[PDB]
């Protein structure tokens, strides 16, 4: 999608997986970080960010 744009994509996705913020199993922040990521996903900030860099 950006210069040099000289390759070609072939085929679709063979599977599906996702990324996540991850932390040692030693801290309480696993809930507020989840609530933060959900809030950002619902407020559409991910769409603004995705439509900033791709």
């Amino acid at each position: 999608q950006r210069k040099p744009c000289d390759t070609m994509k072939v085929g679709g996705n063979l599977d599906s997986k996702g990324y996540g913020i991850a932390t040692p199993k030693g801290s309480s922040l696993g809930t507020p970080v989840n609530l933060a990521v959900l809030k950002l996903s619902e407020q559409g900030v991910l769409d603004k960010l995705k439509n900033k860099w791709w």
Binding site: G18, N34, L35, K39, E42
Partner: protein, 108 residues
């Protein structure tokens, strides 16, 4: 002792449907579908027996406005009427307030 866990769900094609011999069948055999196969797989991995049950009001729903009384598939769990839900239940911030969700198994 093994409890027959109280599974709750909702009828919807092809997730859960009444098999056309439902007039002549009893138990879980009346129910088949993608979510019934998934429930069978989950129970077989965890190693327990289960009994299907169906939502009362027929709604996914939310908490009622200005009262926050829960109902629907969420309400059944919040009031402890059932052990586990296996349904086309979308993950949302309000539902994460009160019930836990697995990692997502399908996207839409």
């Amino acid at each position: 002792e093994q409890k027959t866990v109280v599974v709750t769900t909702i009828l919807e094609s092809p997730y859960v449907m009444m098999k056309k011999n439902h007039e002549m069948l009893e138990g879980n055999e009346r129910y088949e579908g993608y979510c019934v196969d998934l429930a069978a797989e989950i129970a077989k991995h965890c190693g327990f027996k289960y009994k299907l049950t169906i939502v009362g009001d027929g709604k996914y729903g939310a908490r009622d406005a200005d009262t926050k009384i829960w109902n629907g598939m969420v309400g059944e769990l919040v009031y402890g009427k059932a052990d586990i839900a296996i349904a086309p239940l979308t993950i949302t911030l309000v539902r994460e307030e009160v019930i836990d969700f697995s990692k997502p198994f399908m996207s839409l």
